[PDB]
Design a protein around this nucleic acid. Sequence first.
DNA 1: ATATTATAATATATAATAATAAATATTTAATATTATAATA
DNA 2: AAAATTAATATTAAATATTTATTATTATATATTATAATAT
DNA 3: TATTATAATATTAAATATTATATTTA
DNA 4: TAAATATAATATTTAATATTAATTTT
Lengths: 135, 135, 184, 185, 183, 183, 135
Amino acid sequence: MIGRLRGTLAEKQPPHLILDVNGVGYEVEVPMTTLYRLPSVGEPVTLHTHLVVREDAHLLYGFAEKRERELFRELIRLNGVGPKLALALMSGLEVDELVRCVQAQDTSTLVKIPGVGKKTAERLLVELKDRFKAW
Amino acid sequence: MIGRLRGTLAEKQPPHLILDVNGVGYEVEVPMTTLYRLPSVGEPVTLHTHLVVREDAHLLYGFAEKRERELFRELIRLNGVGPKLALALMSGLEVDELVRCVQAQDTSTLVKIPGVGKKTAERLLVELKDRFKAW
Amino acid sequence: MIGRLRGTLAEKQPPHLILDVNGVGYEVEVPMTTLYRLPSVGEPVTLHTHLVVREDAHLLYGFAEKRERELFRELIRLNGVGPKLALALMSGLEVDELVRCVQAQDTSTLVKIPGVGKKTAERLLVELKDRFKAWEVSSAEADAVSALIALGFKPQEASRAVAAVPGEDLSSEEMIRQALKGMV
Amino acid sequence: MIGRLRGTLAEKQPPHLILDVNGVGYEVEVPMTTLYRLPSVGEPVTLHTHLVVREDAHLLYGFAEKRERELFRELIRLNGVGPKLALALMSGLEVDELVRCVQAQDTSTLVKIPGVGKKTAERLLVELKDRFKAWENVSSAEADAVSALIALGFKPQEASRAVAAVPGEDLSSEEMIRQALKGMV
Amino acid sequence: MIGRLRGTLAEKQPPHLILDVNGVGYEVEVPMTTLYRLPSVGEPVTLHTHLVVREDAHLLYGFAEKRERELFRELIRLNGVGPKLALALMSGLEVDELVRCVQAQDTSTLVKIPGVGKKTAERLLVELKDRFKAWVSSAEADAVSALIALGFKPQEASRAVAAVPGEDLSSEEMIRQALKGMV
Amino acid sequence: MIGRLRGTLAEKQPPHLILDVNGVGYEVEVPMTTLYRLPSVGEPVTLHTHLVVREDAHLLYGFAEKRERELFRELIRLNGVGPKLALALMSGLEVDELVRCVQAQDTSTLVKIPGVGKKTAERLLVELKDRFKAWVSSAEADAVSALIALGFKPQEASRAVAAVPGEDLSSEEMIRQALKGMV
Amino acid sequence: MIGRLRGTLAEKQPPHLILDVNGVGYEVEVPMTTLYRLPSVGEPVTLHTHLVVREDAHLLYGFAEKRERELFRELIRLNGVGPKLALALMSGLEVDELVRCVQAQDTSTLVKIPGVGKKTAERLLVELKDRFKAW
DNA sequence: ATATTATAATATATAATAATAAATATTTAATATTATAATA
DNA sequence: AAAATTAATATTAAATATTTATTATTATATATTATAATAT
DNA sequence: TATTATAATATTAAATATTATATTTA
DNA sequence: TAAATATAATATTTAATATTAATTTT
């Protein structure tokens, strides 16, 4: 329903974020790696946003790039894992090292990422064995 | 509920599109026939869209014409047809071709669409026979 | 969640509307009485709106006044009344006409509206009689109370004496006499 | 979905509001405490709205600053608290008042607010003292002692933790109850 | 629905019990305290029961006492209490002792129950505080009326009247025995 | 699914009961009049039970007569009527005067039932007049008023008046025999 | 809600059954293995049953053993496993063979069970390696 | 012969308790994960 | 013309248990009303 | 220096039947 | 060329009743 957002930075209150667009501010959830990429408060910055919908509320996810957003979608399409373990994973590592790690089939590097044990690490490996291309 | 959408094409990625309407770029997917009528990235393009509201998702489907959106509404009103079957019908063939073949009670022109079997074709024709006395 | 729009009428068709707000045109359905008051396509129009929120599909329904939207919210809060039933209702009759018909318990005026049967009139009257009363202990008794206070009665005893009998259509002097003759 | 609206107050009808942003008005409800500082109609205001998603309706709940925004979302996060409850709480009194009362644990300040009874008051006290408000935003002798305290005006909690703090072991009742009476001072 | 079972025990796999009532076994669990009162395999047993209906499951809970069922039901009516919590509580401590601790509102005796947080303890104690109640013949009616005229409440008089003296005794002696009590 | 049960009354606490139907006991909530016409605990009886199902609970409400069960059915069929309202109205009064007051369009008869507002009863009139297609004296109040003005407490005076009313005799003589009660 | 059913075989239409217990004959779904352990029609027999409850239907799945019921419970307690899937699982081959296969990570033998792909088989292997925990 | 006022009753403003009806709020069960206290 | 019947046909949506201001109704001193004799 | 039961917390949640149609193997 | 088998994709309310139009008889 929503794919991208282009507005000025209303404030910076991590890990939440408000983007004032046409005077309208949106609550978005942002990775720490993207927090290293954000400009100053009041800077017009483009965020590629994805929405999740549950029965009592919703959360947006403003992202600075596409392929991170589609990998978010592919991960959250799994029933065993939700969005916030994905947030921990993406705050742990970026796209390319995760791609080689799942292609190398290693749970150990996923273990050091906080909030993740071992069994969910081979969950990520098994489920994402044959989903995507190398880009 | 947006009945018509008029913004600038932020990016092009099949089969979706992102229309940056004054800063906000909606995740909008349109059929390929509209993609033949779609200008390049950055052009102000007007779409007669309609939102599909789900318990866990919301989908926008833009249309360059009002009547194709109306036919999309008629198709999704059918008990077994969702958004993507109607998407296949819109992408495969043209609206006047559909109404002529329904008046002709054709089936082969429908089955030849990929993803369409004899069952869905005979369905759409026989539950659509009653309509189109008004035009 | 939404109260009003300042937009541009991108397209009108019975019975919906398209209001191009900053490039975004919303599907807004309006009654025929509102449709008569609307200017042409491309004119900014004043619609005070309410969204009907259902799991599978929403409904944007706007009105030229706050009062129409508020009364529609009252009608949709009712038990067996749906939205387009009430849309037919104010398409048929206006706010003053409906309010006065409710206060007069009228049915014949409103049964000309299509979709309205006898049970429709029953439910609308039974709800709207007590949902709203005003739409946008007597002077002789007080004089009697003061006169009996001057006569030596306590205010409580004077109130009890004047409330003992329901004096009707009688002057202040004679109602005191009939109340005083009443219990004795 | 909504956090802030750089727009103008299109209408002011208590307790609701219409806040116009680029011609788009929204049905917004705010507490009376906000309504005291809200400027005139048409003036560009500062008000942090909050969306609540239901299967049947949606409403917007504005707030002047971040502190009462966070207070509201955390109060609604409780199992027993609805929107109008926190709206009445903020309309009655301010964030500093409620936090300084909760750390003082007096229900009397809470219960004078209309729609707020006793049970809601100990719910607020207990479930806020349950880790949110550090930062600004027996034997025969002991049973005999407890029964004597109940008969002498003591509510059971002060008769309980006094026994717990200084329990009596293998000695007569009169002296550990005596030092417990010195203990509660 | 289900209020009580009078059936025959089929197998014992604690805490899950199967009760073959006329050919059909019933999936019911009992607390370990009730494990200390179950009969052997094949022996009939009468269990006071009450069901729980979930969105995707139906769960059956059966106790030795009706009052235990009522206390369990009132625990389930609490907003933060699930069946696992109530089974942990009653597997820790028995019913009237927990009632008196609710009168005490003490967390020390309930924290020791495994898997139970202190915050859970005070919230359940506060929302379970005592709003509930604490746990005729010619001579009977004559005594009840006499003590009503003497100022005693009818419910207060009846429990002193019907307890100590027998059935159909002399009115004078049974009124005497009813008024033998002191507080 | 279920319409009738024929078992043995294992336990009867108001307003419910336990009917042990072939080894299985059901908690069935029945009205006050039904409880009045039920036999003792342990006596077999057949009951016109109505199936009640919620997404997270299920109940039964049994009757000694079928027409009670169908009338309960169309009462619950109304959106604005819950089970407690129907149970209260049928516990307070009998069904024949209910259908006659529906025909007579009477409200104050229904209002005196506890938990019944004027709007609730008047609505019940509104839908029941279309649902149903085929299917004390002046001296009594005078004595009460005279006793109230004399000095008697209003409710015990009415108790004395209604204990032995003057249905077949004059007001002065029924006052004379009503003053027997409090002596 | 029913863990054991001592009834009489009224009807034999595989893989469904009717156990007329005191005049009441429920639908009883059994695997083909239990069908080999099943006696003839009219023979009283005890089945150890399990309940599945969803919003539109209830079904009975009666087994010859406790351990069969418990294993079926723990397979349906998985996220991506349906009832007919596990039905085909114990219909294909025996329980202790399944335990040996998952302890030996034998995806090949589990593949030869009909209706089971390689992906589903290795899912079963990885989510059942440690769940048995050698009893 | 008028008040007056020194002793005598009195009646209710202010404490309390007991239904009650409009107005809401409406989810826990299972399981990883991570501390964490205690431990060969 | 004039009421009764029936087949489509669009429409509508299901809420209970609790809870707190909001009304009842029950004492309790205390600032009032009162009288009597009494000088002047 | 690992190692394990316990507890608080913080997530995540729950679809499955029915066709259309790829390779594949005769 | 004819299916087999996963494989993936795609899809997924109901009763129940009140109004109304055409018909039918008087």
